């Protein structure tokens, strides 16, 4: 039961790309984030 077979319904095509990073996952269990895009 604890399987979580997750199917991706995010995109149809995904190609020609530069970055790819993998780590331990980021995530009543409040979870807070701040995203910001400064100088690249």
């Amino acid at each position, epitope marked *: 039961k604890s399987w979580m*077979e997750s*199917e*991706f*319904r995010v995109y*149809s*095509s995904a190609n020609n790309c530069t970055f790819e990073y993998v780590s331990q996952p980021f995530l009543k269990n409040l979870r807070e984030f701040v995203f910001k895009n400064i100088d690249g």
Partner: antibody
Amino acid sequence: VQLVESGGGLVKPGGSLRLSCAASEFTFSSYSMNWVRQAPGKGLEWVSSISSSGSQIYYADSVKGRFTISRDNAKKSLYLQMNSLRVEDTAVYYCATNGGAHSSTWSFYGMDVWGQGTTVTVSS
Amino acid sequence: YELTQPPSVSVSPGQTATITCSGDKLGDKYACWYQQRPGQSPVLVIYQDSKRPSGIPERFSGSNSGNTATLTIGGTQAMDEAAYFCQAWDSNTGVFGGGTKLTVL
């Protein structure tokens, strides 16, 4: 969606065909397609299957190296290249959607939308 | 992998039908069932061994355990006379059952 097939006709053994299964709506994009052939005297056989993206393609043991399933979500069409049509390939073929996006989720669904089948006959 | 279905079974109208499907460790897998009335494209009637698709009356009851998949039809009527294909997926391979024909008198 609403499915219509085409392409089945009279060919001799070893010949070439190219079936089709056209969709009405663009919801076709969200459906993993399956090809199922129905014998003139028996039930159904699974022929092939393709993912919603089209990158997860599988064939039955009796048909690999001969058939080539392909699709076009922008064209809302599903094809099936039909080469080395061989003695027991005479049947009626059904195009059936699964719903599961990838082969890992096919077991969680079933083939729900079938179009009108197309009759394929091989004989000398 | 093969799924074994009896060639045919029959019950009188208004009775309860029971059609079996056998496979190796088949109770660990998801099985779908379809109705093929003669001259007709099949229709899905049971999937995930317990759930019932939209548009199907509740008398189409299916269950799975061990090496047998079973479908139960209480209050069988005339148009339950159809070919019944037990389906299952194993290693990304669509394998269909034999197909049990149900006959109502």
